[PDB]
Amino acid sequence: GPLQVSNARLLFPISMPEDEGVVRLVVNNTDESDLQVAVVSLPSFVSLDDRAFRLQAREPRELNLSLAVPRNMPPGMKDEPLVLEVTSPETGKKAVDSVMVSLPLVDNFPALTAAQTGVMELSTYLDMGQLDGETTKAAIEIRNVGAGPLRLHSVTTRNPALTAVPDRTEIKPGGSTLLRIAVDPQVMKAEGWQSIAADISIICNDPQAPLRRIKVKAEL
Numbered sequence: 433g434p435l436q437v438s439n440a441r442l443l444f445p446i447s448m449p450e451d452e453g454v455v456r457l458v459v460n461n462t463d464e465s466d467l468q469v470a471v472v473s474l475p476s477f478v479s480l481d482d483r484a485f486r487l488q489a490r491e492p493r494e495l496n497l498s499l500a501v502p503r504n505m506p507p508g509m510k511d512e513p514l515v516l517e518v519t520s521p522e523t524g525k526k527a528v529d530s531v532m533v534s535l536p537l538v539d540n541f542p543a544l545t546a547a548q549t550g551v552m553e554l555s556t557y558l559d560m561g562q563l564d565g566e567t568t569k570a571a572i573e574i575r576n577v578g579a580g581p582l583r584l585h586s587v588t589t590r591n592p593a594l595t596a597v598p599d600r601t602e603i604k605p606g607g608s609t610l611l612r613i614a615v616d617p618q619v620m621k622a623e624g625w626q627s628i629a630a631d632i633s634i635i636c637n638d639p640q641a642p643l644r645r646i647k648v649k650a651e652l
């Protein structure tokens with residue numbers, strides 16, 4: 433529709449529950465006349481007072497989403513939409529669109545002791561080579577070398593050809609679990625990709641690196 437947005441995605445920095453922080457979206461009224469804009473839904477972890485405004489023309493206004501983590505929200509990657517409802521007083525009415533807002537929410541580590549935290553060891557680079565038309569599986573061993581249980585709060589992929597699921601989400605000291613990875617070359621083809629280079633993102637209770645990324649490569 434008429435409204436144009438600075439970003440399809442907004443991403444808070446890695447944050448602890450008490451962190452403050454702000455993400456900025458610039459919306460712009462493209463077509464001709466008045467746009468009436470309502471922010472009809474906000475992520476549960478953000479604040480916005482600029483919620484119901486009028487817009488004249490061009491690329492005029494700014495929205496500043498303040499971080500407000502709900503008390504007792506657990507750590508992990510949060511992905512929630514900012515929902516924008518646009519009504520053109522004259523030329524019709526409605527278009528609805530959303531911007532995905534992401535938060536890498538981690539543990540409050542200064543409040544945790546060594547007996548409560550893990551240390552993650554794994555391969556962070558996986559080149560799967562040439563796949564030639566079949567869904568291809570791999571497994572990365574995730575190891576806990578810490579003194580406490582290693583907890584995998586979230587394991588997320590953004591690429592639609594890539595999935596990753598750990599066998600367990602809590603790993604005792606000296607123990608390990610498999611991260612089962614699958615790449616779908618048919619999805620890559622349907623998307624006109626000859627190759628991918630995509631991250632698996634892991635949020636965990638490793639105090640030295642609570643957000644860990646595995647780069648996965650694959651070609652058709």
Ligand code: NA
Pocket residue numbers: 589590591592593594595
């Ligand atoms: Na995916």
